[PDB]
Every structure is written in structure tokens, then in C-alpha cells.
Amino acid sequence: GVLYVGSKTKEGVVHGVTTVAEKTKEQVTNVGGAVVTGVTAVAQKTVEGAGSIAAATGFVKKDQL
Amino acid sequence: GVLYVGSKTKEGVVHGVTTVAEKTKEQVTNVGGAVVTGVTAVAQKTVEGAGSIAAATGFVKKDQL
Amino acid sequence: GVLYVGSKTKEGVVHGVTTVAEKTKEQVTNVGGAVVTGVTAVAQKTVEGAGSIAAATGFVKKDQL
Amino acid sequence: GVLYVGSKTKEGVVHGVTTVAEKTKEQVTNVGGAVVTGVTAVAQKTVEGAGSIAAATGFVKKDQL
Amino acid sequence: GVLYVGSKTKEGVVHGVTTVAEKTKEQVTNVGGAVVTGVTAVAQKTVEGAGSIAAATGFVKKDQL
Amino acid sequence: GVLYVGSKTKEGVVHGVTTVAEKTKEQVTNVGGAVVTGVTAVAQKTVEGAGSIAAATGFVKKDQL
Amino acid sequence: GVLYVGSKTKEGVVHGVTTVAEKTKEQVTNVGGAVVTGVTAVAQKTVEGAGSIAAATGFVKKDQL
Amino acid sequence: GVLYVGSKTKEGVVHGVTTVAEKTKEQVTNVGGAVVTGVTAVAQKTVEGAGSIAAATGFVKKDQL
Amino acid sequence: GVLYVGSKTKEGVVHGVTTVAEKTKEQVTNVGGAVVTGVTAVAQKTVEGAGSIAAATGFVKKDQL
Amino acid sequence: GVLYVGSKTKEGVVHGVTTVAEKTKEQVTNVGGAVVTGVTAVAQKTVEGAGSIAAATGFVKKDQL
């Protein structure tokens, strides 16, 4: 069991990520893959089970078992 | 069991992500894949089960088992 | 069992994501894939079951099992 | 069982996502895929069942099992 | 069972997403796919059943099992 | 003299001031003065003349010359 | 004289001041003065004349010349 | 004289001041003065004349000449 | 005289001042003066004249000439 | 005279001052003076005239000439 009393629990918390990103003449050319160019924020508590993937940012899988 | 009393629990919380992104003459050319260019925010608590994927941002899978 | 008393639980909460994105002469050319260029916000609690996918932003799958 | 008393639970909540997005001469040319360019907000509690997909924003699937 | 007493539960709630989006000379040319360019807001509680899809914004499926 | 040609002049312009102000149990007790608690927006071009006051927000004067 | 040609002049311009101000149990007690608690935005071009005051926010004067 | 050609002049410009100010149990007690507690934005170009005051935020004067 | 050609002049410009100010149990007690507790932004170009004051934030004067 | 050609002049410019100020149990007690506790940003170009004061933040004067 789990018991909290009068507590202030902050679990999986992302506070105030400030970004001032100035670019000029940007070019991106992806080809059949995965690209992430930006602010990201993932918060998780519990992930269970055989063969599990959690908060996969930019994941690429080619499986041929 | 789980018991809280008088608590302030903040689970899976994303607070105030501020972005000031100035670009000029941006170009993107994706070809048959996955691209993410932006502010993202995912909050999760519980994920269960065999073969599970949670909060997959930019995920690419080619499976031929 | 789960029991809360007098609590303030904030589960899976996305608060005030502020974006000031100024662009000029943007071009995007996707071809048969997945593209995300924008503010996103996903909040989830519980996902269950074998072979589950949760909050998939930009997901690409080609399965030929 | 689940029991709350005098609580203030905020589950799966997206509060006040403010966007000031100024563009000029934008062009988008999608071809047979999935594109998302905008503010999105998804809130979910419970998803159950084998082979489940939840809050899929930009999802692309080609399955030939 | 589930029992609430004197509570203020806010489940699956999207509050006040403000957008001031100024564009000039925008062009979009989709071809046989899925495009979303706008403010979206989806709120859900419960989704059940084998082979379920919930809050699918921009979903594309070609299945030939 | 003043001459404009083909111009886009934006003089004294206040664009899109967004406010999400959540309060709880506020109390104000003014006594014989000046109080401003709110969003304000004043735009002016030209003010002329001896002894002039322009866009006075919260002004208090007791003059006994 | 003043002459503009094909220009884009932005004079005295306040663009998109975003505020997310959350308070709880605020109290204010002014007594015979000047108080400003809020978002303010003043834009001015020209003020002329002996003894001039422009965009006075919170001004207090007691003159007994 | 003043002459602009094909220019982009941004004079007296305040762009996107973002504030996320969370307080709890604030108290203010002013007595016969000047108080400013908030976001302010003043833009001015030209102020002329003997004995001039411009963009006075929180000004207090007691003159007995 | 002043002449610009094809220029991009940014005079008196305040860009994107981001503040995430979290307080708890704040108290202020002013007595017959000047107090400023907040984000401020003043932009000015030209101020002229004998005995001039410009962008005075928190100014206090007692003159008895 | 002054002449610019094809230039990018940034005069009196304050760019992106980011502040994450967390306090707890703050107390301020001013008495008949001047106090500034906050983010400030002043931009000026030209100030002229005998007996001039520019961008005075926290100024206190008692003159009895």
C-alpha cells in the first residue's frame, strides 16, 4: 500500500521550459525516417508489460524476427 | 491500496512551456517518414499490457515478423 | 482500492503553453508520410490491453507480419 | 473501489494554451499522407481492449498481415 | 464501485485555448490524404473494445489483411 | 508637409493582448483615491497645448496654486 | 517635411502581451492614493506644449505653488 | 527633412511580453502614494516642451515652489 | 536631413521579455511613496525641452524652490 | 545629415530577458520612498535640453534651491 498525509508530491512534472529560438533561412529535407526539431515535454508515471516502450521521441524500428 | 489525505499531488503535469520562435524563409521537404517541428506536451499516468507503446512522438516502425 | 480525502490531485494536466511563433515565407512539402508542425497537448490516465498505442503523435507503421 | 471525499481532482485537463502565430506567404503541399499544422488538444481517461490506439494525432498505418 | 462526496472533479476538460493566428497569402494543396490546419479540442472519458481507435486527428489507414 | 506612398503605417497600435487571469477570493477596499485592476489599452497620436495630460491611467492630482 | 515610399513603419506599437496570472486569496487596501494592478498598454506619437505629461500610469501630484 | 524608401522601421515597439505569474495569498496595503504591480508597456516617439514628463510609471511629485 | 534606403531599422524596441514568477504568501505595505513590483517596458525616441523627464519608473520628487 | 543604405540598424533594443524567479514568503515594507522589485526594460534614443533626466528607475529627489 501507499499512504500520503499532508504532502505536496510533484511527480513527473515539467515546469516552464522557455525557448527564444531565432533562425534565418532554415532548410530541412528528411527522407523516410524520423526528425524532431522543436520543444518537447513528456511526463509519465507507470508503464508495465513485456515488450514496452515509453516516451519514445525519435524512435525508429525495423524488426524482421 | 492507495490513500491520500490533505495532499496536493501533481502527477504528469506540464506547466507553462513558453516559446518565442522567430524564423524567416523556412523550408521542409519530408518524404515518406515522420517529422515533428513544433511544441509538444504529453502527460500520462498508466500504460499496461504486453506490447505497449506510450507517448510515441516521431515513431516509425516497419515490422515483418 | 483508492481513497482520497481533502486532496487536490492534478493528474495528466497541461497548463498554459504559450507560443509566439512568427514565420515568414514558410514552405512544407510532405510526400506520403506524417508531419506535425504545431502546438500539441495530449493528456491521458489509463491505457490497457495487449498491443496498445497511446498518444502517438507522428506515428508511422508498416507491418506485414 | 475508488472513493473521493472533499477533493478537487483535475484529470486529463488542458488549460489555456495561447498561441500568437503570425505567418506570411505559407505554402503546404501534401501528397497522400497525414499533415497537422495547428493547435491540438486531446484529453482522455481510460482506453481498454487488445489492439487499441488512443489520441493518435498524425497516425499513418499500412498493414498487410 | 466509485463514490464521490462534495468533490469538484474536472475530467477530460479543455479550458480556453486562445489563438490569434494572422496569415497572409496562404496556399494549401492536398492530394488524396488527410490535412488538419486549425484549432482542435477533443475530450473523452472511456473507450472499450478490441480494435478501438479514440480521438484520431489526422489518421490515415490502408489495411489489406 | 507629410507624404506617404504605397506604405503600411501602423501608428499607435495595440495588437492582441491576451490575458487568462484566474483569481480566488479577491478583496479590494479603496478609500478616496484611484485604483485600476484590469486590462487597459490606450492609443494616441497627437496632443498639443500648454498644460496637457495624455493617457493618464491612475492619475491623482490635488493642486492648490 | 517627411516622405515615406513603399515603407512598413510600425510606430508606437504594442504586440501581443500575453499574461497567465493565477492568484489565490488576494487582498488590496488602498487609502487615498493611486494603485495599478493589471495589464497596461499605452501607445503615443507626439506630445507638445509647456508643462506636459504623457502616458502617466500611477501618477500622483500635490502642487501648491 | 526625413525620407524613407522601401524601409521597415519599427520605432517604439514592444513585442510579446509573456508573463506566467502565480501567487498565493498576496496582500497589498498602500497609503496615500503610488503602487504599480502588473505588466506595463509604454511606447512613445516625440515629447517636446519646457517642463515635460513622458511615460511616468509610478511618479510622485509634491512641489511647493 | 535623414535618409534611409532599403533599411530595417529597429529603434527603441523591446522584444519578448518572458517571466515565470511564482510567489507564495507575499505581503507589501507601502506608505506615501512609490513602489513598482512587476514587468515594465518603456520605448521612447525623442524628448526635448528644458526641464524634461523621460521614462521615469519609480520617480519621487519633493521640490520647494 | 544621416544616410543609411541597405542597413540593419538595431538601436536601443532589449531582446528576450527571461526570468524564472521563485520566491516563498516574501515581505516588503516601504516607507515614503522608491522601491523597484521586478523586471524592467527601457529603450531610448534622444534626450535633449538643459536639466534633463532620462530613464530614471528608482529616482528620488528633494531639491530646495
Curated annotation (Swiss-Prot), chains A, B, C, D, E, F, G, H, I, J:
Effect of H15Q: In PARK1; no effect on protein structure; no effect on phosphorylation of the protein; no effect on membrane- and lipid-binding; increases oligomerization; increases fibril formation; increases secretion of the protein; impairs copper-binding
Superkingdom assignment: Eukaryota
Tissues in which the UniProt entry reports expression: Highly expressed in presynaptic terminals in the central nervous system. Expressed principally in brain.
GO molecular function: actin binding; alpha-tubulin binding; beta-tubulin binding; calcium ion binding; copper ion binding; cuprous ion binding; cysteine-type endopeptidase inhibitor activity; dynein complex binding
Keyword Secreted carried by entry: yes
GO annotation, cellular component aspect: actin cytoskeleton; axon; axon terminus; cell cortex; cytoplasm; cytosol; extracellular region; extracellular space
Subcellular location: Cytoplasm; Membrane; Nucleus; Synapse
Positions of the UniProt region annotated as 4 X 11 AA tandem repeats of [EGS]-K-T-K-[EQ]-[GQ]-V-X(4): 1-32
Sites where the protein binds Cu cation: H15
Effect of mutating E11K: In PARK1 and DLB; significant increase in binding to negatively charged phospholipid liposomes; increases oligomerization
Post-translational modification: Phosphorylated, predominantly on serine residues. Phosphorylation by CK1 appears to occur on residues distinct from the residue phosphorylated by other kinases.
Disease: Genetic alterations of SNCA resulting in aberrant polymerization into fibrils, are associated with several neurodegenerative diseases (synucleinopathies). SNCA fibrillar aggregates represent the major non A-beta component of Alzheimer disease amyloid plaque, and a major component of Lewy body inclusions. They are also found within Lewy body (LB)-like intraneuronal inclusions, glial inclusions and axonal spheroids in neurodegeneration with brain iron accumulation type 1.
Record family assignment: Belongs to the synuclein family.
Name of the protein described by the UniProt record: Alpha-synuclein
Provenance organism: Homo sapiens (Human)
Encoding gene per record: SNCA
Full-protein residues shown: 36 to 100 of 140
